[PDB]
Design a protein around this motif. Structure first.
Motif, PDB file in Angstrom:
ATOM      1  N   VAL A   1      15.049  79.653  26.808  1.00  0.00           N
ATOM      2  CA  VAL A   1      15.080  79.200  28.652  1.00  0.00           C
ATOM      3  C   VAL A   1      14.263  80.856  28.766  1.00  0.00           C
ATOM      4  O   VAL A   1      16.060  82.044  28.313  1.00  0.00           O
ATOM      5  CB  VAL A   1      16.535  79.455  28.610  1.00  0.00           C
ATOM      6  CG1 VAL A   1      16.666  79.030  29.681  1.00  0.00           C
ATOM      7  CG2 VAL A   1      16.936  77.750  27.880  1.00  0.00           C
ATOM      8  N   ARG A   2      13.521  80.609  29.733  1.00  0.00           N
ATOM      9  CA  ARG A   2      12.834  82.283  29.271  1.00  0.00           C
ATOM     10  C   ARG A   2      13.374  82.561  31.534  1.00  0.00           C
ATOM     11  O   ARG A   2      13.707  81.631  31.991  1.00  0.00           O
ATOM     12  CB  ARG A   2      12.032  82.438  29.873  1.00  0.00           C
ATOM     13  CG  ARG A   2      11.397  83.852  29.337  1.00  0.00           C
ATOM     14  CD  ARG A   2       9.835  84.175  29.686  1.00  0.00           C
ATOM     15  NE  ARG A   2       9.338  83.546  28.429  1.00  0.00           N
ATOM     16  CZ  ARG A   2       9.415  84.594  27.421  1.00  0.00           C
ATOM     17  NH1 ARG A   2       9.872  85.790  27.439  1.00  0.00           N
ATOM     18  NH2 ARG A   2       9.619  83.619  26.220  1.00  0.00           N
ATOM     19  N   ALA A   3      13.774  84.428  32.203  1.00  0.00           N
ATOM     20  CA  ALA A   3      13.652  84.608  33.249  1.00  0.00           C
ATOM     21  C   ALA A   3      13.143  85.020  33.132  1.00  0.00           C
ATOM     22  O   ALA A   3      13.022  86.363  32.900  1.00  0.00           O
ATOM     23  CB  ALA A   3      15.597  84.726  33.427  1.00  0.00           C
ATOM     24  N   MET A   4      12.225  85.549  34.507  1.00  0.00           N
ATOM     25  CA  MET A   4      10.924  86.546  35.192  1.00  0.00           C
ATOM     26  C   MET A   4      11.455  86.443  37.122  1.00  0.00           C
ATOM     27  O   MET A   4      11.163  85.616  37.095  1.00  0.00           O
ATOM     28  CB  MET A   4       9.708  86.181  34.496  1.00  0.00           C
ATOM     29  CG  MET A   4       8.634  86.603  34.781  1.00  0.00           C
ATOM     30  SD  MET A   4       7.227  85.972  35.174  1.00  0.00           S
ATOM     31  CE  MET A   4       6.752  86.397  33.156  1.00  0.00           C
TER      32      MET A   4
ATOM     33  N   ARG B   1       4.047  92.371  32.731  1.00  0.00           N
ATOM     34  CA  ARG B   1       5.499  91.131  32.844  1.00  0.00           C
ATOM     35  C   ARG B   1       6.430  91.314  31.768  1.00  0.00           C
ATOM     36  O   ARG B   1       6.466  91.639  30.667  1.00  0.00           O
ATOM     37  CB  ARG B   1       5.013  89.898  33.661  1.00  0.00           C
ATOM     38  CG  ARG B   1       4.048  90.219  34.556  1.00  0.00           C
ATOM     39  CD  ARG B   1       4.240  88.700  35.489  1.00  0.00           C
ATOM     40  NE  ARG B   1       3.011  89.329  36.272  1.00  0.00           N
ATOM     41  CZ  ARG B   1       2.766  89.054  37.949  1.00  0.00           C
ATOM     42  NH1 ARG B   1       4.346  89.734  38.326  1.00  0.00           N
ATOM     43  NH2 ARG B   1       1.970  88.711  38.252  1.00  0.00           N
ATOM     44  N   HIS B   2       7.991  91.719  32.807  1.00  0.00           N
ATOM     45  CA  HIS B   2       9.268  91.591  31.732  1.00  0.00           C
ATOM     46  C   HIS B   2       9.508  89.788  31.799  1.00  0.00           C
ATOM     47  O   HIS B   2       9.891  89.996  33.001  1.00  0.00           O
ATOM     48  CB  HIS B   2      10.229  92.288  32.316  1.00  0.00           C
ATOM     49  CG  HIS B   2       9.657  93.652  32.593  1.00  0.00           C
ATOM     50  ND1 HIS B   2      10.155  95.167  33.453  1.00  0.00           N
ATOM     51  CD2 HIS B   2       8.944  94.988  31.388  1.00  0.00           C
ATOM     52  CE1 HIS B   2       9.552  95.809  32.999  1.00  0.00           C
ATOM     53  NE2 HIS B   2       8.707  95.661  32.541  1.00  0.00           N
ATOM     54  N   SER B   3      10.379  89.589  30.996  1.00  0.00           N
ATOM     55  CA  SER B   3      11.443  88.690  31.224  1.00  0.00           C
ATOM     56  C   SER B   3      11.808  88.976  30.398  1.00  0.00           C
ATOM     57  O   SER B   3      12.347  88.845  29.414  1.00  0.00           O
ATOM     58  CB  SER B   3      10.367  87.047  31.092  1.00  0.00           C
ATOM     59  OG  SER B   3       9.651  87.390  29.587  1.00  0.00           O
ATOM     60  N   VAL B   4      13.258  87.599  30.346  1.00  0.00           N
ATOM     61  CA  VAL B   4      14.092  87.556  29.162  1.00  0.00           C
ATOM     62  C   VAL B   4      14.678  86.290  28.836  1.00  0.00           C
ATOM     63  O   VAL B   4      14.681  86.089  28.956  1.00  0.00           O
ATOM     64  CB  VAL B   4      15.715  88.389  29.333  1.00  0.00           C
ATOM     65  CG1 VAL B   4      16.215  87.733  30.404  1.00  0.00           C
ATOM     66  CG2 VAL B   4      16.499  87.926  28.727  1.00  0.00           C
ATOM     67  N   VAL B   5      15.214  86.405  27.179  1.00  0.00           N
ATOM     68  CA  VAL B   5      14.601  84.596  27.066  1.00  0.00           C
ATOM     69  C   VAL B   5      15.655  84.354  25.867  1.00  0.00           C
ATOM     70  O   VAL B   5      16.334  85.254  24.967  1.00  0.00           O
ATOM     71  CB  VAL B   5      13.028  84.286  26.366  1.00  0.00           C
ATOM     72  CG1 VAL B   5      13.332  85.481  25.141  1.00  0.00           C
ATOM     73  CG2 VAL B   5      13.268  82.698  25.974  1.00  0.00           C
ATOM     74  N   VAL B   6      16.833  83.402  26.320  1.00  0.00           N
ATOM     75  CA  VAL B   6      17.919  82.746  25.410  1.00  0.00           C
ATOM     76  C   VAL B   6      17.183  81.831  24.369  1.00  0.00           C
ATOM     77  O   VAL B   6      16.470  80.828  25.233  1.00  0.00           O
ATOM     78  CB  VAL B   6      19.423  83.189  25.728  1.00  0.00           C
ATOM     79  CG1 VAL B   6      19.494  84.725  26.394  1.00  0.00           C
ATOM     80  CG2 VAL B   6      19.403  81.771  26.912  1.00  0.00           C
ATOM     81  N   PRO B   7      18.116  81.237  23.312  1.00  0.00           N
ATOM     82  CA  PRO B   7      17.630  80.490  22.931  1.00  0.00           C
ATOM     83  C   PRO B   7      18.390  79.313  24.094  1.00  0.00           C
ATOM     84  O   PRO B   7      19.750  79.212  24.067  1.00  0.00           O
ATOM     85  CB  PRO B   7      18.915  80.104  21.582  1.00  0.00           C
ATOM     86  CG  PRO B   7      18.033  82.092  20.945  1.00  0.00           C
ATOM     87  CD  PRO B   7      18.152  82.174  22.141  1.00  0.00           C
ATOM     88  N   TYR B   8      17.752  78.090  23.685  1.00  0.00           N
ATOM     89  CA  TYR B   8      18.559  76.873  24.574  1.00  0.00           C
ATOM     90  C   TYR B   8      19.958  76.578  23.871  1.00  0.00           C
ATOM     91  O   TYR B   8      19.161  75.776  22.838  1.00  0.00           O
ATOM     92  CB  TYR B   8      17.616  75.626  24.832  1.00  0.00           C
ATOM     93  CG  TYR B   8      18.500  74.416  25.678  1.00  0.00           C
ATOM     94  CD1 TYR B   8      18.811  74.343  27.044  1.00  0.00           C
ATOM     95  CD2 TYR B   8      18.904  73.523  25.154  1.00  0.00           C
ATOM     96  CE1 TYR B   8      19.667  73.716  27.576  1.00  0.00           C
ATOM     97  CE2 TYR B   8      19.714  72.576  25.697  1.00  0.00           C
ATOM     98  CZ  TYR B   8      20.176  72.111  26.520  1.00  0.00           C
ATOM     99  OH  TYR B   8      20.304  71.550  27.599  1.00  0.00           O
ATOM    100  N   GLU B   9      21.240  76.016  24.518  1.00  0.00           N
ATOM    101  CA  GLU B   9      22.091  75.495  23.894  1.00  0.00           C
ATOM    102  C   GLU B   9      22.750  74.168  24.783  1.00  0.00           C
ATOM    103  O   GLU B   9      22.884  74.616  25.938  1.00  0.00           O
ATOM    104  CB  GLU B   9      22.666  76.690  23.508  1.00  0.00           C
ATOM    105  CG  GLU B   9      22.836  77.188  21.965  1.00  0.00           C
ATOM    106  CD  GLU B   9      23.553  76.815  21.060  1.00  0.00           C
ATOM    107  OE1 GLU B   9      23.831  75.696  21.188  1.00  0.00           O
ATOM    108  OE2 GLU B   9      22.043  76.588  19.693  1.00  0.00           O
ATOM    109  N   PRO B  10      23.409  73.457  24.325  1.00  0.00           N
ATOM    110  CA  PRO B  10      23.363  72.536  24.967  1.00  0.00           C
ATOM    111  C   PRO B  10      25.004  71.992  25.645  1.00  0.00           C
ATOM    112  O   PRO B  10      25.567  73.528  25.123  1.00  0.00           O
ATOM    113  CB  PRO B  10      23.568  71.139  23.280  1.00  0.00           C
ATOM    114  CG  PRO B  10      23.089  71.518  22.985  1.00  0.00           C
ATOM    115  CD  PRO B  10      22.751  72.825  22.865  1.00  0.00           C
ATOM    116  N   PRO B  11      25.760  71.577  26.859  1.00  0.00           N
ATOM    117  CA  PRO B  11      26.442  72.391  27.184  1.00  0.00           C
ATOM    118  C   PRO B  11      27.685  72.523  25.691  1.00  0.00           C
ATOM    119  O   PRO B  11      27.757  71.383  25.153  1.00  0.00           O
ATOM    120  CB  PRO B  11      26.703  71.070  28.530  1.00  0.00           C
ATOM    121  CG  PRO B  11      25.590  70.656  28.336  1.00  0.00           C
ATOM    122  CD  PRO B  11      24.823  71.004  27.273  1.00  0.00           C
TER     123      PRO B  11
END
Ligand SMILES: [Zn+2]
Ligand SMILES: [Zn+2]
Lengths: 197, 196
Positions: free
Chosen positions: A63-66, A119-129
């Motif tokens: 999951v990435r945000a930019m 460009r900069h982005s921040v990314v985490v592994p997707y996790e189920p709820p």
DNA sequence: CGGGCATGCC
DNA sequence: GGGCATGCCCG
């Protein structure tokens, strides 16, 4: 050099975003405007973003945000922290100092400064709820005000959230406008009222 | 450690004068006698007049340096903020970190002090031109008093020293400075805040 | 320059 | 929350 796509794309997993309902007390640390699709927040304060899916993406999904400038006149320019905040030593231990967007609370966070787009982005592994929950919540922070001279300099930004496989292939995409400011309640209220005039 | 701000007219009767510019909202530079304070816009000409009773010797120089006014910051070097340091406003002579420049003087020299790291700008003293009774220097201030990461709303003083060629003190005077967007507005406001 | 307002801060 | 400090835009 080029511009990232901001086109809402639910994809095969029915990927969409959700936000808490927070109210508009003059300050309030973070508040979201459904009318504007725009987050209003204070510098370095928790900004919860909910990830909703219909199926569940495989493990290894990320999951990435930019951030990008909303206005076409600045869209090729990389969104970065201003010279002051870049130099202010408010490191959380992992986020590089030039990055506007951080993720709170996640040991597996990674920061990217793309070799070719810059460009900069921040990314985490997707996790189920969690059990008893219908969505995954990521806690973002924005580390400069929209007004900071030498950085955003009052130019509005969009945050693009993308769902991607392990190689970086697009699985889904959504976006929201964000204003980082001293008084999110006041400013949210002002922009909503400008829509009724 | 902190440089002296003690006024002294010294043997040449050195003192400062300022133009009397009034308080229209956005006057570019305006001086308040009641406050002994100059109010001016970023990068605009700030004329400072040097008045003497007799001509100092050949080789005399005139130095300007800024210091913080409040005791809690007096030990800190006054410098431009990270933003302004990096903006493309060089005149090709002043160091980008320096708050105070002199314009219109090809003989300007800038110093970062060996021990204190404080910045200053120095020009040769010249006697008044024919018909004039004072010598005018055109200073520019290159950061607002309010700038985050620099002065950040702390008041400063400019100290003007007359020096011999070796740097020995001949005279000193000082004034508070506020660099701001609306000097007239802000002067009128401060002078109104004096009153009960 | 500067009225009118944006945007920091307490 | 109100407010007041203090900057910017475009005429
Ligand atoms: Zn900043
Ligand atoms: Zn500055």
């Amino acid at each position: 050099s080029s511009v990232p796509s901001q086109k809402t794309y639910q994809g095969s997993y029915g990927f969409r975003l959700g936000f808490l309902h927070s109210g508009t007390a003059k300050s309030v640390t973070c508040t979201y405007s459904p009318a504007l699709n725009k987050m209003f927040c204070q510098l370095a304060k928790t900004c919860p973003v909910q990830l909703w899916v219909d199926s569940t993406p495989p493990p290894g999904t990320r999951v990435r945000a930019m951030a990008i400038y909303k206005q076409s006149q600045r869209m090729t320019e990389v969104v970065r922290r201003c010279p002051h905040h870049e130099r202010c030593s408010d490191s959380d231990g992992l986020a590089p100092p030039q990055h506007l967007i951080r993720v709170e609370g996640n040991l597996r966070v990674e920061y990217l400064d793309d070799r070719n787009t810059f460009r900069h982005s921040v990314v985490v592994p997707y996790e189920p709820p969690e059990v008893g929950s219908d969505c995954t919540t990521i806690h973002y922070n924005y580390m400069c005000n929209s007004s900071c001279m030498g950085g955003m300099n009052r130019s509005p930004i969009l945050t693009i959230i993308t769902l991607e496989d392990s190689s970086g292939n697009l699985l889904g995409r959504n976006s929201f406008e964000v204003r980082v400011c001293a008084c999110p309640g006041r400013d949210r209220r002002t922009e909503e009222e400008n829509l009724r005039k």
